[PDB]
């Protein structure tokens, strides 16, 4: 299925891209390969 980048720390600049996804952090602190509590996968 097609994918969406529905999580970013900042806003996208015009004619830019974001291909590298490293567990979007909601603000807990640790998100190294873990979706625990705050951290969620940016791609849905």
């Amino acid at each position: 299925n097609y994918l969406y980048r529905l999580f970013r720390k900042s806003n996208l600049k015009p004619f830019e891209r974001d291909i590298s996804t490293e567990i979007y952090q909601a603000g807990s602190t640790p998100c190294n390969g873990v979706e625990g509590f705050n951290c969620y996968f940016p791609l849905q």
């Binding site: 909601a26 603000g27 807990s28 509590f37």
Partner: protein, 49 residues
């Protein structure tokens, strides 16, 4: 103790300022499926009641 399952808790709390991030940071709750705020918390917006 209780709030009933057939009835609902619709307490009208308003005219106050509180930090939603205070409850967000606490891990006592089970899960977060918030619909209002996109990024993290409601502390950047104001509402009615």
């Amino acid at each position: 103790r209780f709030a009933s399952v057939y009835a609902w808790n619709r307490k009208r709390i308003s005219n106050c300022v509180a930090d939603y991030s205070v409850l967000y940071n606490s891990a006592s709750f089970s899960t977060f499926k918030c619909y209002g705020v996109s990024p993290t918390k409601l502390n950047d917006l104001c509402f009615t009641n």
